[PDB]
């Protein structure tokens, strides 16, 4: 998810 991405 783009290097992490914790919400959308």
Q: Alpha-carbon distance 2 to 7, whole Å?
A: 11
Q: Got the DSSP string for 1-8?
A: -TT--S--
Block residue for tokens 């783009």? 2
Cα–Cα distance, 4 to 8 (Å, whole number)? 11
**Technique that determined the structure:** NMR
Report how far residue 8's alpha carbon sits from residue 3's, in angstroms, rounded to the nearest whole number: 13
Task: Measure CA of the first residue to CA of the last residue in the chain; give whole Å.
Answer: 9
Question: How many residues are present in the chain?
Answer: 8
């Amino acid at each position: 998810r783009x290097g992490x991405x914790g919400g959308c």
